[PDB]
Design a protein around this ligand. Sequence first.
Ligand SMILES: [Mg+2]
Ligand SMILES: [Mg+2]
Ligand SMILES: [Mg+2]
Lengths: 450, 434
Amino acid sequence: GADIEVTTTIDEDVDNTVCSLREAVELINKRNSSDSTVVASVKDGYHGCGNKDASSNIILQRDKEYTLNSRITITAPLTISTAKNDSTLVDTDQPGSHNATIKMAGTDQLFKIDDESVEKASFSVLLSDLNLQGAGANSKVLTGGLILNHEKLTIQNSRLTGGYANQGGVIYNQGFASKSDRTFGFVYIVNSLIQNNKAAQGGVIYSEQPLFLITQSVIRDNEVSNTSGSLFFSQDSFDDESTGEYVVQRAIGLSNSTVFHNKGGFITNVRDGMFVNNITMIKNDKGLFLEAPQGNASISNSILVGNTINCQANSTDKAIIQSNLVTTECNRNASVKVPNILYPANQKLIAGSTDEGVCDVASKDGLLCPFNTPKDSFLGFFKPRLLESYNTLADSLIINKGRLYSVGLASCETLDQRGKRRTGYDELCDLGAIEYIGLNDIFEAQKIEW
Amino acid sequence: ADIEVTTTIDEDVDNTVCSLREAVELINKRNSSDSTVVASVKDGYHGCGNKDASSNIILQRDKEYTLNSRITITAPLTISTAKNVDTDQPGSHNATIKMAGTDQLFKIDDESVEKASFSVLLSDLNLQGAGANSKVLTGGLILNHEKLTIQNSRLTGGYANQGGVIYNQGFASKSDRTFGFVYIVNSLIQNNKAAQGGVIYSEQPLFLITQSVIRDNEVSNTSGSLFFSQDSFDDESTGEYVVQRAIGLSNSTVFHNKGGFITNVRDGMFVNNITMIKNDKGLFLEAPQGNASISNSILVGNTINCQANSTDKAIIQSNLVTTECNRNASVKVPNILYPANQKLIAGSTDEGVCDVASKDGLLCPFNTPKDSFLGFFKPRLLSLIINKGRLYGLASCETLDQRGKRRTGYDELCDLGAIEYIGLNDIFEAQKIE
Ligand SMILES: [Mg+2]
Ligand SMILES: [Mg+2]
Ligand SMILES: [Mg+2]
């Protein structure tokens, strides 16, 4: 049926003619109630949010800001997204430039997602094309600065900012995973910008077990104040003998993501069952903390240099690190068939002197362009450089150094951070979050000449 | 008169017998705002007569009432066992509510956004959950969103993912008066299990357990707690709560529990005059403001007695402690150090007959007198706990002990733990000199 379009930007639950975001969620919660009188109470709507065969899709208007004075509790599957324009019209606007904003005006988290139904467990929630802004420095949140989650949470095409808490700056993810514990929270984030989030532990995500997957995203300017902690922190390991299947499945970890300028502790603590593939992790305080003692973790096809601490291992760890651009710090447990690419001492990582800015095509050194967001892209990245000092592609430390065979646990991703397909010509791919595709640097070098 | 349940089976069928489910439905429908639903129960509901029937549901002594799925309570009511003057052991004739399926026993919630919470009383009952056959996720016995009071009862067999006995929903504020609050008095909590919140999983610390026994429970997450609160109160309210002693644990015996901690002490909570011995893990301290008080308790004999996070400032005064629970910042009301070589219990086991002719045991083994519903560890006259508290001030003794006996003056002194030593039974039974 019809989607629920929120018709006021204020935070309210008052029976009147307008529909608020809180009321739109409360409508979907009540239609999902196990009490027949509650379901019948919202047969024709709830306090301004019309119903009568309405969908579970909540629509927010483009370029509008919706304020919350306290948390919204979600007890039923639903989606919240920004209204989409006509696709048959010329849309040259930059992606994500018209996202609706959900803004915390108080000191609370934005959402709590949980369920207390007799069976009928683990529903899904989709947050799409939204600007989620937390309380920031005014936050009083203990766990989950933006969201406390116990369900199947997917966030896409979104900005995640201002999530401050003691544990889990963006998300605190509850729940343990086993054959008997089937009601656990899981976090899936794709094509999103994660910035300005802080926590004492789990600066971005604090999860009780490795139950998150971050792909095609930018992670910048976040902090975990415990310098031994992590931005994506797993409190406990899995109950053994199951991690050998999780890693080959590549269901938990980080992929196709650019991670730079983060502060304090590590990006993530790599436990058994987790994987890291095709990420660009540079210019951070700390990179990867390795504690996969069974050897059921995989780190591949990534750029893991230019951080104050690139890798650091716990007392027992056997994480398989292969086909990465690394220094000696991260050259651990590498196989002879899939070795890492060692980072030479005399190697300049970024062209020019700025970590972020316009790239100088007429620069003879520098593996990567500075960070930049093209006008046709939501997220920015460090584009690999095809230098003139490369007689062949074998001279590059990044380009065509991976293998694109779900084969061998060292295969590149099918896509890159931008969502573009990695062609896999000659079964080869580029290290890091970005596959080299367009050759405008070569075109421009001919025009600048003479 | 009260609503008398006249069958032990579970049903909602229009016939000649009144079931517990139909007795609750009668009260729910009478409280409805729909005048047609109210009229449908004008002359009773499906066998439960309703002409002079109140909101008190009565179950028969020594009878077991089976539920095959949960009952949803949406209206104020009480459930209790019929009375009888009476010299039997208290609680020996309780009616039993037993889950025969895989569900929780009760969901207590009208699901109203605006309406303030209503009151439900469960008195003199044996509540037994599905146990190993449970499929419950939240609230092995009760999913609560209202003002739930449980007294004189047994709470056993509650198995769930969150909240072995009770899952308590709600946040407390002047603009949100729909929060649930659990008040448990003179009850036995035993053989319950959860991944988090082995007994109570609560969103905020909205519970007070007093004069009760907590034994043989488990929270499988070794970082979790039996009485677990997921969130904290507002910083501005914790100062009042700790002084008023609104939420926490008092006058209770806690032993033989497994897995994680007994409770995670957040700001606003208090612990006073408990005997917390022989557990896997004791208290987890999590009060960064310093607005939490732990006093007059016995906090030794557990594998882990206390453990705090980096920022905890919980006030720990006048307790029997080891290194983990001791604080050098308590100079005026210090704790008492428990020696290692001393035997905690003057007996061969943790439960059974007390060894009267001894000078090495601080407490008698756990024993239930025949004139009492709950048992306890009675102190012995030898010293480390007798007259070590002050009646009198966050460190004041409770006015009563677990048994409801008054802790007398005794030069403004009281005994640490859940039991006040009153009778000189130790000294009289030393007549064995032959
Ligand atoms: Mg309205
Ligand atoms: Mg009947
Ligand atoms: Mg209510």
